[PDB]
Design a binder for this molecule. Structure first.
Ligand code: OGA
Ligand code: MG
Ligand code: NI
Ligand code: ZN
Length: 331
């Protein structure tokens, strides 16, 4: 078995190997990359996502989210308070202000220490989940707006044509902006490209050990657990590496820098934080290997998780027993 310790693997494809996306994902899996839940892909030196980032300031962040924490430094939840619209140029200036900017630090480890010590005492503002793309239309390789769709994968594998679409999303971050512990909708893959700015630190639990994280989460968030049998779908709970280590949960960490891709694999729980002003683009995708994970994915039916139009068909076809109850949650 390849990668039996479930380490995060880092790949350096050549420009030739960067042509065929599906083939390269299958290659990484042949080497055991999925066992980690997360892999890094450094693009060939010849590749670029677009020519420059000099003209992005007028993108609108219609609903910036203030991430307010509750709990203790290592075990907390966050809620998202909606703020007034602002442009990316306005948001960059805010991220660089004295109130929100990255503090002085020695290295990524010192910054990580500061994040876990101090996150709860601040409420950073995240421009998340913005439909759109920063890839130039002429970028042919690993263009996250030109991937094969999940609906087409399901049709190819299973023969059933379904409604729905699959487009990318932009994320504008600042120091301390946080992504809570989660797997993807329907335990899909994700791919995330850090277009510009400061790094993003990731934490990940191997898919084979995801239920250990779930059991810890039920213990740490006991009211949320009684409220919903899949409350990590709400995407609000944070647990620090120190707490994970104290409770014996297998996990790994890595820092993504600008110009790098990350892939999350089906049922790979992940969480993390941004180091400073940045912009990422991410989208879900599927492969043949996903179908079995899609069939077994948990679902939130309490009503909190509320997701896209396109998830309907995935539930309806892959999980017809759950359909009814999950749709009640969605309406
Ligand atoms: O970058 C973020 O805030 C969160 N991204 C992801 O969870 C992802 O790409 O799967
Ligand atoms: Mg612009
Ligand atoms: Ni994710
Ligand atoms: Zn729920």
């Amino acid at each position: 078995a390849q990668n039996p310790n479930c380490n995060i693997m880092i790949f350096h494809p050549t420009k030739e190997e960067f042509n065929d996306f599906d083939k390269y994902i299958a290659y990484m899996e042949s080497q055991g990359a999925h066992r980690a839940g997360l892999a890094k892909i450094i693009p060939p030196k010849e590749w670029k996502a677009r020519e420059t980032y000099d003209n992005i300031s007028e993108i609108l962040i219609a609903t910036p989210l203030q991430q307010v924490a509750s709990g203790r430094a290592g075990v907390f939840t966050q809620y998202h308070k909606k703020k007034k619209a602002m442009t990316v140029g306005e948001y960059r200036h805010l991220a660089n202000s004295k109130k929100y900017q990255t503090p002085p630090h020695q290295n990524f480890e010192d910054l990580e220490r500061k994040y876990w010590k101090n996150r709860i005492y601040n409420s950073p503002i995240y421009g998340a989940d913005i439909s759109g793309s920063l890839f130039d239309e002429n970028t042919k390789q690993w263009n996250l707006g030109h991937l094969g769709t999940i609906q087409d994968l399901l049709e190819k594998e299973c023969g059933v044509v379904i409604e729905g679409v699959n487009t990318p999303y932009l994320y504008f971050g600042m120091w301390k902006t946080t992504f809570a512990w989660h797997t993807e909708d329907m335990d899909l893959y994700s791919i995330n490209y850090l277009h510009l700015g400061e790094p993003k630190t990731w934490y990940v639990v191997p898919p084979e050990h995801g239920q250990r994280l779930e059991r810890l989460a039920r213990e740490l968030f006991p009211g949320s657990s009684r409220g919903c049998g899949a409350f990590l779908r709400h995407k609000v709970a944070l647990i620090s590496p120190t707490v994970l280590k104290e409770n014996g949960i297998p996990f790994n960490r890595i820092t993504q820098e600008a110009g790098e891709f990350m892939v999350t694999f089906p049922y790979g729980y992940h969480a993390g934080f941004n180091h400073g002003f940045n912009c990422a683009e991410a989208i879900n995708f599927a492969t043949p290997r996903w179908i079995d994970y899609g069939k077994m994915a948990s679902q939130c039916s309490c009503g909190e998780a509320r997701v896209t139009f396109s998830m309907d068909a995935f539930v309806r076809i892959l999980q017809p027993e759950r359909y009814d109850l999950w749709k009640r949650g969605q309406d």
